[PDB]
Amino acid sequence: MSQSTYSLEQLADFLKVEFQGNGATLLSGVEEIEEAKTAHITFLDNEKYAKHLKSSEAGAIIISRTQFQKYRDLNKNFLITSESPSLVFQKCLELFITPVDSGFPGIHPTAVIHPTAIIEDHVCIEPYAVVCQHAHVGSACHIGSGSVIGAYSTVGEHSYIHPRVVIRERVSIGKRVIIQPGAVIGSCGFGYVTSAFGQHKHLKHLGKVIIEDDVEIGANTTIDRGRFKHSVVREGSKIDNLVQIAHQVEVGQHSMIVAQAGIAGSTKIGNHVIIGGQAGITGHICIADHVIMMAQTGVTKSITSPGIYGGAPARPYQEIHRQVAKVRNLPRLEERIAALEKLVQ
Amino acid sequence: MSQSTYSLEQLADFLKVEFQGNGATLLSGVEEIEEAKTAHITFLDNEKYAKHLKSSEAGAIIISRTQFQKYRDLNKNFLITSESPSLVFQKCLELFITPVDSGFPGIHPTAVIHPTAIIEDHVCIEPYAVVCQHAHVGSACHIGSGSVIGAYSTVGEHSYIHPRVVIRERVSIGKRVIIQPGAVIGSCGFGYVTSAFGQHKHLKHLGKVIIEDDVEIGANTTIDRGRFKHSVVREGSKIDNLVQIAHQVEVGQHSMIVAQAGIAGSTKIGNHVIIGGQAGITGHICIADHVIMMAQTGVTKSITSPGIYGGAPARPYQEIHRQVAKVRNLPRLEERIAALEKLVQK
Amino acid sequence: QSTYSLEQLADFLKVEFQGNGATLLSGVEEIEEAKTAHITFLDNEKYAKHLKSSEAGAIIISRTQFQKYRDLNKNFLITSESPSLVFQKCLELFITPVDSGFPGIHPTAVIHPTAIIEDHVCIEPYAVVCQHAHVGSACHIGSGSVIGAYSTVGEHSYIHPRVVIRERVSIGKRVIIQPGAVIGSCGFGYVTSAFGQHKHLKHLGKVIIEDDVEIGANTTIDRGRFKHSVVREGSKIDNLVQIAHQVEVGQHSMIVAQAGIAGSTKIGNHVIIGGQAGITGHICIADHVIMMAQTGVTKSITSPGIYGGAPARPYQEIHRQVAKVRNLPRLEERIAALEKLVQKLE
Numbered sequence A: 001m002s003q004s005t006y007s008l009e010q011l012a013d014f015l016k017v018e019f020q021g022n023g024a025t026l027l028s029g030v031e032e033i034e035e036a037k038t039a040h041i042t043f044l045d046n047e048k049y050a051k052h053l054k055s056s057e058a059g060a061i062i063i064s065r066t067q068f069q070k071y072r073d074l075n076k077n078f079l080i081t082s083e084s085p086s087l088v089f090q091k092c093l094e095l096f097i098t099p100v101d102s103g104f105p106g107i108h109p110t111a112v113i114h115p116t117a118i119i120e121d122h123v124c125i126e127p128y129a130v131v132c133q134h135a136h137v138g139s140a141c142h143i144g145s146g147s148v149i150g151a152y153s154t155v156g157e158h159s160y161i162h163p164r165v166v167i168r169e170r171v172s173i174g175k176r177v178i179i180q181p182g183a184v185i186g187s188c189g190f191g192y193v194t195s196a197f198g199q200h201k202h203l204k205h206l207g208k209v210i211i212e213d214d215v216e217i218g219a220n221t222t223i224d225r226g227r228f229k230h231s232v233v234r235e236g237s238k239i240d241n242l243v244q245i246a247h248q249v250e251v252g253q254h255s256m257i258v259a260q261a262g263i264a265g266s267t268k269i270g271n272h273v274i275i276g277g278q279a280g281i282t283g284h285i286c287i288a289d290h291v292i293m294m295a296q297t298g299v300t301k302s303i304t305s306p307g308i309y310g311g312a313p314a315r316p317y318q319e320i321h322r323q324v325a326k327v328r329n330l331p332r333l334e335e336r337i338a339a340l341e342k343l344v345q
Numbered sequence B: 001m002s003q004s005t006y007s008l009e010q011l012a013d014f015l016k017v018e019f020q021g022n023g024a025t026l027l028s029g030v031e032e033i034e035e036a037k038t039a040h041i042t043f044l045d046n047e048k049y050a051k052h053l054k055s056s057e058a059g060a061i062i063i064s065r066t067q068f069q070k071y072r073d074l075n076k077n078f079l080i081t082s083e084s085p086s087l088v089f090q091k092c093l094e095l096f097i098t099p100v101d102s103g104f105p106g107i108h109p110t111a112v113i114h115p116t117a118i119i120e121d122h123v124c125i126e127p128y129a130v131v132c133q134h135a136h137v138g139s140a141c142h143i144g145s146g147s148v149i150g151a152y153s154t155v156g157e158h159s160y161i162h163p164r165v166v167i168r169e170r171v172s173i174g175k176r177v178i179i180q181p182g183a184v185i186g187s188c189g190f191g192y193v194t195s196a197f198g199q200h201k202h203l204k205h206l207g208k209v210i211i212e213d214d215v216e217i218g219a220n221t222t223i224d225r226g227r228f229k230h231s232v233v234r235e236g237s238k239i240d241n242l243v244q245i246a247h248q249v250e251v252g253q254h255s256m257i258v259a260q261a262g263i264a265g266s267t268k269i270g271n272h273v274i275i276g277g278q279a280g281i282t283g284h285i286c287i288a289d290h291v292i293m294m295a296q297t298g299v300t301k302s303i304t305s306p307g308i309y310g311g312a313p314a315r316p317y318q319e320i321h322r323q324v325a326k327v328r329n330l331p332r333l334e335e336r337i338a339a340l341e342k343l344v345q346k
Numbered sequence C: 001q002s003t004y005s006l007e008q009l010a011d012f013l014k015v016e017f018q019g020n021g022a023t024l025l026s027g028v029e030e031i032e033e034a035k036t037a038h039i040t041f042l043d044n045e046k047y048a049k050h051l052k053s054s055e056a057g058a059i060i061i062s063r064t065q066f067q068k069y070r071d072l073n074k075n076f077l078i079t080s081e082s083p084s085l086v087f088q089k090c091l092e093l094f095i096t097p098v099d100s101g102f103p104g105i106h107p108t109a110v111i112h113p114t115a116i117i118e119d120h121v122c123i124e125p126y127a128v129v130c131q132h133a134h135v136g137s138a139c140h141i142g143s144g145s146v147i148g149a150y151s152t153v154g155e156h157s158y159i160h161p162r163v164v165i166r167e168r169v170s171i172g173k174r175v176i177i178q179p180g181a182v183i184g185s186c187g188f189g190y191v192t193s194a195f196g197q198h199k200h201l202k203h204l205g206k207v208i209i210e211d212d213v214e215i216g217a218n219t220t221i222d223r224g225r226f227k228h229s230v231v232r233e234g235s236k237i238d239n240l241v242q243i244a245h246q247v248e249v250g251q252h253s254m255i256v257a258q259a260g261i262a263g264s265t266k267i268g269n270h271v272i273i274g275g276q277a278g279i280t281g282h283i284c285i286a287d288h289v290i291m292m293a294q295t296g297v298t299k300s301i302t303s304p305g306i307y308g309g310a311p312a313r314p315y316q317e318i319h320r321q322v323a324k325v326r327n328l329p330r331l332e333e334r335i336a337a338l339e340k341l342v343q344k345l346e
């Protein structure tokens, strides 16, 4: 609704934060640091940008105490914080732009709930959502339009599920979980026995999917259920869009899987891992904790020790960095085998 | 059986196109030029050398004025146009297979429409679709069965939204846009802050997504919203299936993204660009106008000049072509040290 | 969930046992962490090391494999069938499938008067069956799914929730389709003005899914401009897969998650396409060809065998290539020091 302006000083008092420069500077929105004019509050997160600070027009830059110590002399208007400058920036963001809901509060009449399903306090089920037999929908839970909550599936308190998500049977979603539109949770794992005449016999997958607390699942991401055990995404992990997660995959706590990456069956990913965009990881292997996998990686063996890895096959960062450099240098190496065929003897 | 027969001349008059050949020739279907028979209507590509034309045994051949000039002397039945042969072929095709909707005209009773939302005239909203608060659906739109138009979002006139599409809140769709089944427009960016030794906190994404006119978005493709700025697909760009558009990516006009490709956050892609299938582009870069990236390209840095690119990391095409070759020639280069090490006399 | 003894299990399975047939067992579990109460099996090799020291109450094992471990004092169940299959027979003794609790045709189903629905068929809340569709007997139509105009579903097929089937698609007998899939979206074909502009062409071809095909979650299959796209019988397709327009997938082929096949390409019978592999348009893949994950096929393949890499090359050749690439620092040695006989200046 708004088109609000506030004074630098007003913003500071709001943010409960120290400031230097004109208290009366007028600020009408937020903007990233390179683009920002005198109308905008902005931030610098960590040194990545730097060059963009002394030239910036920003009428206010949100800064940390160390960065203020580092940039003290520059003639800018600062808001000095001890929290993440990006996280203080978010507070400003939320001043100018407020979230918006669908405008269908509580349980819409068109929402179908099976008699055996248990509905908790303060829940919101949107038009045309379907809750199946013996499902548990938690307290303060949001279920979006045309979403499905399958048989025996449970959705822990404060979870938010966007429009057209499919939560198959026997899936348990933890607390404070966010699922973007299109996500499929609990699809059949891709398991066959090929007969001698080359015909593929389906193996009925009767496992579960466990998605733990504070996990996020992206748009149109598909997580398959295990054959008999469980596919698991552990507490705090964040999964981007269009991601494959095959039967009996386990993802650790506080891990990140970027868009369009895929992980084959019975692979375990450790805690605090990053899987880069469009990466691929085979079945029946492990990734150790604190591993970062670059974008477009093909990982063919377990990665046993922490560090950065890239390429396909995946090799440690230094080894692949060298490999690329040497491949670019083949023309210059043939030139050296050339000069050598200058031999008279 | 064929629902229809026409004479060359009858069809010429239907198409509003000149003809050259035998006006009485009978025509009862369409086929591609290398498979067409006497009863068939076909078109001349734009490629396809003279040999394709000559040995074609087809009742009629849709051709352009320029091409005709070059092939005046050939005894074929020609349907000569100043438009694109294919576009004209299209109309011919539509005489043998007629397009079919779902059979639910106008606004279905089961559609749910928030009182605060404004639905223009002549709109088709199919069964079980939801239109949220302060949404605006323009005149002559189609909202597919079960699709969702989010809070405050706008759809321009003559847009076709197929079934089970999610348009999230604050999304702007222009005129004549087509969105395939299952697409997701305005999901949240993948943007987090890291605290407590690598725990990831959610950052509310409150920017919009802007889709300009004549843009097409393929099936199950996902287009995230910016953090505060906007994700933008410009005029006339066409996006395939299973594509990822990351937070606040800007795509130029008349650019093409092929299936399964992905652009990471905050990247600019200029006009007349083509991103081949299953490609990846990192965040915070630029692709100049008129760039073509081959399938499975992995782009790591900006591209500032036009032309074809491939490989991962992406290099100009000339480059990865020599590379593949020198790599392939590795044994034959090692064989040359199996000989240039025998000469080690004294 | 109950308990059985080895002997009872052997007799149920019609399979021979070795070890003590009094051993009580009550569940299943992967080969490593199987206790005396768990049944397990061995059907690859990468977990074979876990056998010597595994504690399973029962190990289902092939006649061939049994030779290598029959000396160990583990309880074995020995079969000449698929160990995995025999294992499945056990699995189903402890866990049972669950339906949604909505039998037959839910009153919210919206069915067009001109559609035909056979006997003994389930249609779950808010499904939408459009004009001139036919749904065979013993079919399951999952919640919020769409069956488009003139589309048919063969008997005993299972459509999971939120599946979209567009116009003129024919699903064969006993097919499974996972949530989110999209069958019969528009092919990615445009007429490109010389000027750069891209013009839409309604795709009107039919799409055919033959009996026993399985299609994965969120997989998208496009229809041809006017000619047909076919998935021949028995083929299994995984999640997030792109099948572009006019593709023929031969019979009993496997396509793994996130693969993509480009336009009007023909895949043989008994073909395996690995995860994230890509195949260009207008080419051919011979019978019994196996692509590895992340393969990039750029040319037709005609000889059966294992293929990998990008561009695709036969197994032993890409192996050797990776090998010679890794070797490059070592090969530079034999060069650096080969050059350092400019000491032959004397």
Ligand SMILES: CCCCCCCCCCCCCCCC(=O)O
Residues within 6 Å of the ligand: A277, A278, A294, A295, A296, A310, A311, A320, A321, A324, B262, B263, B264, B279, B280, B281, B282, B283, B298, B299, B300, B312, B313
């Ligand atoms: C230095 C050599 C590394 C090997 C080259 C491949 C990956 C480089 C890392 C940057 C990202 C690659 C492009 C994919 C981007 C994406 O999908 O989001």
Ligand SMILES: CCCCCCCCCCCCCCCC(=O)O
Residues within 6 Å of the ligand: B276, B277, B278, B293, B294, B295, B296, C260, C261, C262, C277, C278, C279, C280, C281, C296, C297, C298, C310
């Ligand atoms: C880039 C596709 C256009 C066709 C022109 C031929 C260029 C060679 C194909 C690029 C190499 C990658 C092969 C995978 C193809 C795909 O994913 O669709």
Ligand SMILES: CCCCCCCCCCCCCCCC(=O)O
Residues within 6 Å of the ligand: A262, A263, A264, A279, A280, A281, A282, A283, A297, A298, A299, A300, A312, A313, C275, C276, C292, C293, C294, C295, C308, C309, C310, C318, C322
């Ligand atoms: C980009 C490939 C060319 C180079 C040589 C290719 C052989 C090794 C790469 C195989 C990747 C296997 C990773 C599995 C990915 C997945 O499961 O989806």
